[PDB]
Paper text:
FtsEX comprises a cell division-regulating integral membrane protein (FtsX) and a cytoplasmic ATPase (FtsE) that resembles an ATP-binding cassette (ABC) transporter. The folded structure (residues 57 to 166) reveals a central core composed of a four-stranded antiparallel β-sheet (β1, β6, β4, and β5) and two helices (α1 and α3), an α-helical lobe (residues 107 to 135) harboring the α2 helix, and an extended β-hairpin (β2 and β3). The helical lobe mediates a physical interaction with the peptidoglycan hydrolase PcsB via the coiled-coil domain of PcsB (PscBCC).
Three different structures, with resolutions ranging from 2.0 to 2.3 Å, were solved by X-ray crystallography, each in the presence of a different detergent. In all cases, two independent protein molecules are present in the asymmetric unit, arranged in such a way as to keep hydrophobic residues from their α-helical lobes buried. In any case, the crystal structures suggest that changes in the protein backbone and side chains of the helical lobe occur when a detergent ligand is bound. A similar interaction pattern is observed for detergents 2 and 3; additional interactions are observed in N131 with detergents 2 and 3, which are characterized by a larger hydrophilic head (maltose). Full stabilization of the hydrophobic tail of the detergents is completed by the same hydrophobic residues (W123 and F126) but from a symmetry-related molecule.
Numbering used by the authors:
A (entry chain B): 54 to 82, 86 to 96, 103 to 139, 143 to 165
B (entry chain A): 50 to 165
Write the structure that this text describes.
Amino acid sequence: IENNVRVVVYIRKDVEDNSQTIEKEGQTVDYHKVYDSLKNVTFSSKEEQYEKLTEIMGDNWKIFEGDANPLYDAYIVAPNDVKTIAEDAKKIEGVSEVQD
Amino acid sequence: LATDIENNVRVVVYIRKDVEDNSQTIEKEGQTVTNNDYHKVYDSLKNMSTVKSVTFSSKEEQYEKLTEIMGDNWKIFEGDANPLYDAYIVEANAPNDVKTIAEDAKKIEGVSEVQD
Ligand SMILES: CCCCCCCCCCCO[C@@H]1O[C@H](CO)[C@@H](O[C@H]2O[C@H](CO)[C@@H](O)[C@H](O)[C@H]2O)[C@H](O)[C@H]1O
């Protein structure tokens, strides 16, 4: 991954940029314009982030299992060419935060 | 004001996120009405003979303490809903009462988890 060339872009909790079907009603359904808007790069799920967290810190966090995942879906994305797209990435609608 | 109790005598009782045990009023049908379940968890804990005190710890103050321990704000979470839990810090009368208090606390309606 490498810190030097990496930017993290967390997407808002109320946005589903990668599940095509969206069930607000009981049935099928914004989209990929998050994805390749940064292309002009890879997706990291909140559920993977949570497994990685337990892997790093030790066993489950038993007090949270019965409730929603508080982490954010994100997209993991030259050294001097960093601060730029960081600012750029906060522009996009739906994005919660970005980190450089 | 700060609470001060020994580890060997403490039980943490985590409150279900949909239970407002410490709110005297809630909104029902668009009006502010008294909360009929106010202090239901508190009262079940306080009424155990083996319990010395029961102190509310809000998720807001827990977050503040978390940043005071770990440093800085967790920037990317700020503005979003606090995922920590409201809790009661329970002080047992004696260390041998802790295991019984925990099990008994788990059964209370409105309790999400307990840590002994
Ligand atoms: C699964 C792993 C668990 C990770 C847990 C993450 C760490 C806790 C994150 C909590 C961040 O959530 C944040 O909480 C605090 C207090 O509740 C709130 O920020 C606060 O700032 C001002 C003052 O600075 C307070 O007066 C006010 O109570 C609140 O808005 C904020 O509204 C919320 O956005």
